[PDB]
Design a protein around this ligand. Structure first.
Ligand SMILES: Nc1nc2c(ncn2[C@@H]2O[C@H](COP(=O)(O)OP(=O)(O)OP(=O)(O)O)[C@@H](O)[C@H]2O)c(=O)[nH]1
Ligand SMILES: Nc1nc2c(ncn2[C@@H]2O[C@H](COP(=O)(O)OP(=O)(O)OP(=O)(O)O)[C@@H](O)[C@H]2O)c(=O)[nH]1
Ligand SMILES: [Zn+2]
Ligand SMILES: [Zn+2]
Lengths: 433, 456
């Protein structure tokens, strides 16, 4: 029962029955209703792709790499069981994403609940657990040779990292440390996750992809480094890697950090914040959750997708009028206006818990040339945008942009002044344009 | 100094301000929430694309073609005004599509209201009218040289055809060729098809062998039977064959996919079970159902693929049945394929008769009586058309060519064959006995009807 799925990036993807069973669940199929690039679709009409197809792709590539390593180096003792667990991890690494992907955990939850610590990865673990239990996957795992308790632990570790000196992982021993570099590779940012989305995003955006992932897989090997096992590239592949990094940079410059695309993300977020008190999502035991609290209950979170945009847009409730009106601004293309950009000096990083305060700080700033119209915190949006040792055998770490909700020439002028001053008060770089 | 949109199929698409204004409306942006291939996404994960981006592409290509014709043959007197009206028509030809595109007008409305005669094209006209009025587009049209009353008429005619010698009132007969750009019924060669062949191929992973740019570049208006028509250079004949083979591949591989079509009928089943209980607010606070929203454009504006998730995420006990079918789709417990047949040599099945077909099948009398009997609600009968209205033809016959030396007049003159109507039957009961039974009813029904005999 080896099922085959046609993908425009990878061609034929063969799926193990166990994977098919994980895929055919509400928890996984949910990913069909979550846009890969969030608000990017509103700037790039080719970018209609969702997390679902990306996740299949990552699961596929994860398998290809591990399987290839096992053939070339049977001394690594990569079992078929190891292969499946890595595939599953690749499949399920994005289960925890929320509406509009990175917009949700990167901005909405911070602004809505600054107290809480939340990442989509943590979400992926919770949702995976929920998926397993809700659909009786453990017996099916056993039926294909897996040992649920340790293997489920391994899968979770691949996704989120060590779960809390030593070898921190408990799902596999240190002699298989290389397996933890396939799906999510923290240290050098080279994993199959990135391979898929670079290729996929390029394909949909109309941007040229220079990296050849197959070639890289074909020439990859596990090799000794600092008395540790790591995945290593042949020296002949160095050009291919440069091409990868250039593709990455292009995607970030051209798409991920696009000026209007990011503005639209903050407008969508603004609408969610205005809707959060009034939207009800039913979770476990009939209990009711808000957009911002659905992350606390996986039954509710399952039903939280980009649909929430249209539920607000199509609503008639008077209580949702404000939220609805912002989404209508997007349709009519009356967007927030770009004021300017700056960076934090030093190794200083504005943190998520502080995001909510930033608009007030900006309005609190005192421009020396006092002006006619004064602006308040509600009129400002402050957007914080985040972001050679691979083994062989201009990058801004944080950008800060400010937008204004009032498009009046004088308000824009004013806003600029507040912004410039705020940068000065914080010893941030001085705005240009 | 006009706006540019990056598209993966066409590259840079330059948009006239007036087009930008039509695009930035709820009525147009609605197309972002309607899947091009409907239930095809549930089989082809690459096919996440929506009608919106397709519509930009068609608008763009419509403009390219007309503009190219005007440069090569200024004796045609194609104004800038003409160009814009054709672009707008290309932009807006799909405004009338409903949830899951062709599933909606092709199956749901027929099953829900067999009385009514509805096409997405008619919808596009109504929605266009609604778009114009709701967003004060007439003054803006005037501001860029258009004459709203006649030009709006022309645009609508390009989309739906004529209403009620020369049938068109939006442009005179000496510009008859303009009516062949966006929608060409006669020979099925228009910019609409060019975009979706390319776009669908790009998303499905199927190779596209037609080269639309080349065709545009060598296209010319030329005399045929004292009729002005768009004519291809004789050198382009291979390119055309490639187009028709691409079309055939897309249909065989994608549009007629077995499970994809099953899923379309499951979605439709859910809608039918939800239709009584879903309320959509239209004009003046009046409430409409999924099946009646087509009667009110304010309501229809809010009718998109979202309706799938509204049903899926619902808690109302009255929607339990509809909801349960959509859950079957998530769990991948689909209706079961019984078999396939054709009305070869027969009169073809019409939309108003779709609702009756499941009863006919259960009414059929198999010779070998089975242990269990089945009823009409257990059968789905799916009628698949390549192009519903049209006669079984060869479309190359209606293509005009020209030789370069005598470019003013048309030349005097191994593709695939069409099964222009397929009929499939699915069963809602998945147990061996019922499936066996269903097969028997089906085989008999084909016999009773002088349809082709089912194979495997
Ligand atoms: N199961 C499944 N298949 C998908 C999905 N998305 C795309 N597909 C593809 O669509 C095809 C049809 O769905 P299935 O019902 O699994 O197809 P099938 O081959 O008839 O399999 P059975 O019905 O189980 O015999 C699959 O073979 C896959 O190639 C998905 O989410 N789940
Ligand atoms: N206007 C508009 N632009 C879109 C749409 N879809 C994608 N885009 C692209 O998104 C870009 C940014 O949107 P705009 O608000 O037009 O931004 P802009 O190009 O800076 O134009 P202004 O904001 O009017 O100066 C556009 O230039 C288009 O290339 C759409 O539906 N409407
Ligand atoms: Zn990912
Ligand atoms: Zn179309």
């Amino acid at each position: 029962t080896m099922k085959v799925i046609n993908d425009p990036i990878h061609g034929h993807i063969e799926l193990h029955p166990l994977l098919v069973r994980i895929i055919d669940t509400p928890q996984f199929q949910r990913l069909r209703y979550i846009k890969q690039l969030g608000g990017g679709y509103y700037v790039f009409p080719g970018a209609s792709h969702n997390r679902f197809e990306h996740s299949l792709g990552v699961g596929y590539l994860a398998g290809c790499l591990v399987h290839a390593l096992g053939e070339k180096q049977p001394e690594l003792q990569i079992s078929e069981r190891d292969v499946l667990c890595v595939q599953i991890a690749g499949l399920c690494h994005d289960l925890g994403h929320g509406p509009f992907s990175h917009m949700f955990d990167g901005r909405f939850i911070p602004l809505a609940r600054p107290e809480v610590k939340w990442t989509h990865e943590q979400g992926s673990v919770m949702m995976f657990e929920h998926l397993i239990n809700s659909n009786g996957i453990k017996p099916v795992m056993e039926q294909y040779g897996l040992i649920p308790e340790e293997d489920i632990y391994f899968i979770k570790e691949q996704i989120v990292g060590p779960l809390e000196s030593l070898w921190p992982y408990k799902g596999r021993p240190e002699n298989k440390s290389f397996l933890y570099e396939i799906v999510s590779n923290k240290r050098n940012g080279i994993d199959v996750d990135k391979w898929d989305y670079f290729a996929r995003d390029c394909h949909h955006l109309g941007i040229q992809n220079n990296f050849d992932y197959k070639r890289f897989i074909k020439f990859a090997r596990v090799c000794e480094v600092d008395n540790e096992l790591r995945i290593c590239a042949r020296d002949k592949e160095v050009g291919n890697l440069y091409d990868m990094f250039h593709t990455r940079n292009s995607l970030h410059r051209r798409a991920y950090q696009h000026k209007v695309g990011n503005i639209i993300d903050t407008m969508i977020t603004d609408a969610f914040l205005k809707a959060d008190d009034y939207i009800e999502i039913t979770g476990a035991g009939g209990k009711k959750y808000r957009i911002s609290t659905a992350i606390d209950d996986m039954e509710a979170y399952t039903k939280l997708t980009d649909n929430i945009f249209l539920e607000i847009l199509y609503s008639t409730d008077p209580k949702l009028k404000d939220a609805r009106e912002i989404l209508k601004q997007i349709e009519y293309r009356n967007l927030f206006k770009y004021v300017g950009e700056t960076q934090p000096t030093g190794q200083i990083k504005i943190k998520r818990e502080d995001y909510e305060s930033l608009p007030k700080e900006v309005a609190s700033a005192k421009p020396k040339v006092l002006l006619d119209v004064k602006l308040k915190a509600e009129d400002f949006i402050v957007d914080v945008i985040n972001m050679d040792h691979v083994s062989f055998y201009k990058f801004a770490e944080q950008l800060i942009r400010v937008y204004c909700k009032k498009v009046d020439r004088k308000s824009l002028y004013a806003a600029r002044q507040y912004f410039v001053q705020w940068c000065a008060d914080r010893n941030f770089t001085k705005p240009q344009d």
